Design a protein around this ligand. Structure first.
Ligand code: MG
Ligand code: MG
Ligand code: MG
Ligand code: MG
Ligand code: MG
Ligand code: MG
Lengths: 136, 102, 66, 214, 149, 132
RNA sequence: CCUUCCCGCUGGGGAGGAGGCACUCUGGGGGGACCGCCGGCGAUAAGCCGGAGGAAGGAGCGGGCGACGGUAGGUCAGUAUGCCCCGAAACCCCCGGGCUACACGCGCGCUACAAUGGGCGGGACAAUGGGAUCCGACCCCGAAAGGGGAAGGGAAUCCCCUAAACCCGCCCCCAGUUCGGAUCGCGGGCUGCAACUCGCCCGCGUGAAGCUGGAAUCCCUAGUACCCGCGUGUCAUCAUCGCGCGG
């Protein structure tokens, strides 16, 4: 028994029954590397399937995600290190992540910097040329 | 007895050979033991320019080359031998270098 | 699978043919069937040397040319 | 392989790949018999040494010609299965070790099936995949006619091997079947002379087009 | 019997399994994290990759003798997918192999020539040749043409 | 201590073989031929041995040091070197002729080398050219 | 030959010293291949073909040297040079910007659209070239990029330099996916006087089109093409480029 074709981890982001690390990459803010980290620190097998995940294991990786560094994750393996309002080095997930992106962008816009301007016009801003190969 | 390395380098095999024959014939004039003219790998300085100033037209290249032939000779260091190999003519397009192994 | 094909041995190469030079006119001699020695001239595609054997689905076509 | 004896297979007899013999192998097409090399050649690999001449192909082993045709990269300038294939970097071009293993796995496959010498199977397949007549356009007095012509045995071989390999390629392209399996399937299908084989089909079509052209 | 007599990969896995029984071969706290190099894309998928890596290094030091970290770096490196850009060769990180070498010097298997790198000890080559003769037997059940050697 | 040295060359690969009386052991860079991991390379190296036969190999021991380009070039250079070694060890011309009709390049070398690359898209080749 | 270390089945393996140039290699001088021999075709000639033998077989293979002359072809923006002009500005130097802008059209290419594969871990095998404020082994620090110290090396002595494609095992099993890596966020570094405009690198994260491509078109005849990576030139730092190297 103990099978579930679908599993909710970090809310109701709902994950298939493939192996767990890739199921977790199904979340925004989690790649396969951060996933493997989280599972190694939580003692879970990454090759394990998600249907055989127990609610306490769910809780465990959820709380790791809530405070990764406190559990053994390094500070150089996180979405948002050295945040612009709290020097805490933290890892952000779906909604908080899009909000953080939005906020830093529109901070730049508020101060009317090149990146903010170039964001709001939807053009490249990391040194590209845009003449021959950015056409939409 | 301590030995003397003579590293000599040129762009002309014939000047090079002239010097080595000078050394051979002088050592056998005396009786000091030569170590042959060991030929070392010759350096090919290659420079591949484009032969056009215009930048127009088909691209064509000049592969210019300079060749440096190198020999080394080890001969036992005697004051006589050393004096006379110093007296050697050492033509203009050649470099030499007498190190001594002791 | 080998249907009613008739072997034929190549005895002499003649000029090459074809709009693009891929074809070779050749003289061949049947080996089996009823002819059993009737030479004939055929237009063969591909490389040939004398002694080669080409098998024909017929024998009464006989293309000719110089 | 995952048996360690197939991984460190040691040859002793001068069989082909040290596994299959050719003494018992026979070709009933007399036009192909000279041009099919079946020597006791352990390693098929030749190192190009034949191409510089005009019939070194005749002097070359047959499974070598197969693996060389299997070193394919699909179809780049023509459409097999209606499709350009155009594997560029994930091809086997210049990878004869991979091609060798592909062919070897194919042979093992069919011999697990087919209870036969796979080289016998292969010669049957090229025999009943090899056409006899083709068509080409010739000028007579300045006017073009799509005439029919007979095909030389070397060219017959070339086509047979080519389109065997090409059928394997089309069947392995973008689907779950392996190249080796496609190859096995193609060879036994053609040897049984069923139209499921790309090669038999292609032979039949060029031949019926010829018999239409005369 | 010896290292040159048997193959490499089998030997590395066997001697890794055996190195788990050595106490100076603890992984460092940053192992479950980091890749093996910038040329890689993903974390190692195994848990005992540390032991596999030090086993490999041990064998490499057996074979190539007075060798050091930069040489091993270029051996443990490889190709990188540089995106849309073409592929190039990149060396690996040095910390893995350094910590490994230091663990091995602690366990007694390698020593550190003042210059020209690190050198296997007698107890080390004994360790490796023991595992090799064992392996050779187990695959001499197979190839007797290898029983020969 | 009758030992015989032979050499083989194949496009930037040089093998130096030494042959002597022994048991049948043949080693490429300290490694048995038996365990050489690409089957093709193993078979290139083994062809002369299979062809000559166990009857003499089992009395021969060989060691090859090969210091060149690729695994295939190394294998061919080794094949050459040991073929020559066997022939010069045995003085058997029936064997020489067996080799020379199986593969002449087993005893004579392959003389081919790579053609120097020429300007237009030179990195690719001497005849490989840019697109028009 | 000497000394030493391991397996152990007591058979075998490696390492360092003299040993000597054997083998390889290097580089000077010679030789060797000439359709020379056999046969055939062409005319019996010129010569072509097949074969033998040979390392090499048909100008051996590959390059360099580009005739007289034309092209008002390109270059006075490399130098040289006539005329015209500027000539205290159209001369010289400095700061900053720009040449890096982007609704679009085109050329050449890189990466892909996956299993003729992707990832992880293990295992292998090169050559060409280059090195003085330059290569930098080796040690230590660091997760990485990188940082500190530093042997030797003005070059067959040292270093760059244990390549990748390949192989073995394990996950993935035909799907916008463990394919693809555009884009973007955060952080950490190197070069430089300066990194915003506008550099390169690393780590976490994001996860764009794209599921083989019409008409039409390009390159290539043997160690060639395709595939794989490397070196060097440019270079303070920058290589999807050029010239080259091998697999
Ligand atoms: Mg000549
Ligand atoms: Mg003009
Ligand atoms: Mg003009
Ligand atoms: Mg990917
Ligand atoms: Mg698909
Ligand atoms: Mg450029």
């Amino acid at each position: 028994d103990e099978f579930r074709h679908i599993v909710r981890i970090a809310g109701v982001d709902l994950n298939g029954n493939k192996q767990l690390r890739w199921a977790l990459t199904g979340i925004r803010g989690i790649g396969i590397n951060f996933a493997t980290m989280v599972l190694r620190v939580a003692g879970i097998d990454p090759y394990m399937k998600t249907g055989y995940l127990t609610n306490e294991q769910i809780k465990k990786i959820e709380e790791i995600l809530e405070d990764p560094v406190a559990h053994g994750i390094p500070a150089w393996a996180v979405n948002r290190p050295k945040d612009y309002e709290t020097g805490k080095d933290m890892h952000l997930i779906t909604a908080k992540l899009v909000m953080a992106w939005r906020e830093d962008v529109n901070r730049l816009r508020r101060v009317r910097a090149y990146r903010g301007i170039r964001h709001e016009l939807g053009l490249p801003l990391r040194g590209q040329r845009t003449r021959s190969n950015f056409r939409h | 007895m301590q030995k003397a390395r003579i590293k000599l380098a040129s762009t002309d095999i014939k000047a090079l050979n002239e010097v080595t024959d000078q050394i051979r014939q002088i050592a056998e004039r005396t009786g000091v033991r030569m170590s042959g003219p060991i030929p070392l790998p010759t350096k090919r300085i290659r420079i591949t320019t484009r032969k056009s100033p215009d930048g127009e037209g088909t691209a064509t290249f000049d592969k210019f080359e300079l060749r440096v032939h190198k020999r080394l000779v080890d001969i036992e260091a005697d004051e006589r031998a050393m004096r006379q190999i110093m007296r050697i003519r050492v033509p203009e397009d050649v470099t030499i270098e007498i190190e001594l192994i002791s | 699978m080998s249907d009613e094909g008739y072997p034929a041995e190549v005895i002499e190469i003649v000029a090459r043919t074809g709009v693009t030079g891929g074809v070779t006119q050749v003289k061949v001699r049947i080996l089996e069937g009823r002819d059993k020695g009737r030479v004939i001239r055929r237009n063969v595609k591909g490389p040939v040397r004398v002694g080669d054997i080409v098998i024909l689905r017929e024998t009464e076509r006989e293309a000719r040319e110089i | 392989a995952k048996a360690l004896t197939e991984r460190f297979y040691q040859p002793k007899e001068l069989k082909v790949m040290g596994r299959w013999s050719v003494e018992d192998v026979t070709v009933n097409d007399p036009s192909l018999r000279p041009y099919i090399n079946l020597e006791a050649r352990l390693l098929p690999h030749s190192h190009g040494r034949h191409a510089k001449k005009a019939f070194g192909k005749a002097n070359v082993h047959i499974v070598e010609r197969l693996i060389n045709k299997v070193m394919r990269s699909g179809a780049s300038s023509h459409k097999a299965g209606g499709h350009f294939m155009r594997r560029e970097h994930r091809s086997l071009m210049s990878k004869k070790m991979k091609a060798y293993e592909v062919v070897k796995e194919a042979f093992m496959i069919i011999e697990r099936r087919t209870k036969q010498n796979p080289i016998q199977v292969l010669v049957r397949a090229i025999e009943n995949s090899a056409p006899r007549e083709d068509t080409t356009t010739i000028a007579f007095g300045g006017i073009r006619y799509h005439m029919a012509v007979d095909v030389s045995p070397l060219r017959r071989l070339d086509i047979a091997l080519k389109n065997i390999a090409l059928g394997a390629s089309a069947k392995c392209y973008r689907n779950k079947t392996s190249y080796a399996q496609a190859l096995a399937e193609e060879i036994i299908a053609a040897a049984n002379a069923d139209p499921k084989s790309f090669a038999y089909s292609r032979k039949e079509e060029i031949e019926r087009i010829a018999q239409s052209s005369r | 019997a010896t290292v040159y007599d048997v193959p490499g990969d089998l030997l590395v896995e066997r001697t890794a399994k055996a190195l788990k029984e050595v106490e100076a071969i603890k992984p460092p706290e940053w192992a479950p994290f980091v890749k093996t190099g910038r040329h890689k894309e993903r974390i190692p998928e195994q848990e005992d990759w540390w032991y596999y890596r030090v086993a490999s290094i041990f064998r490499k030091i057996y074979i190539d003798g007075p060798v050091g970290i930069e040489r091993l770096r270029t051996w443990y490196g490889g190709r990188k997918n540089r995106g849309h850009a073409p592929e190039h060769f990149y060396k690996a990180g040095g910390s893995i192999i350094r910590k490994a070498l230091q663990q091995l010097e602690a366990a007694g298997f390698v020593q550190k020539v003042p210059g020209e790198g690190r050198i296997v000890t007698p107890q080390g080559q004994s360790f490796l040749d023991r595992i090799a003769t064992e392996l050779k037997k187990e695959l001499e059940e197979q190839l007797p043409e290898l029983k020969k050697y | 201590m009758k030992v015989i040295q032979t050499a083989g060359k194949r496009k930037t690969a040089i093998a130096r073989a030494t042959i002597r009386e022994g048991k049948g052991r043949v080693r490429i860079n300290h490694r048995p031929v038996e365990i050489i991991e690409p089957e093709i390379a193993r078979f290139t190296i083994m062809e002369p041995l299979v062809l000559a036969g166990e009857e003499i190999v089992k009395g021969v021991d060989i060691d090859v040091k090969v210091e060149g380009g690729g695994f295939m070039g190394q294998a061919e250079a080794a094949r050459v070197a040991i073929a020559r070694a066997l022939v010069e060890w045995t003085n058997d011309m029936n064997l020489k002729e067996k080799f020379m009709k199986y593969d002449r390049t087993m005893l004579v070398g392959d003389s081919r080398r790579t053609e120097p690359h020429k300007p237009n898209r030179s990195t690719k080749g001497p005849r490989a050219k840019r697109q028009k």
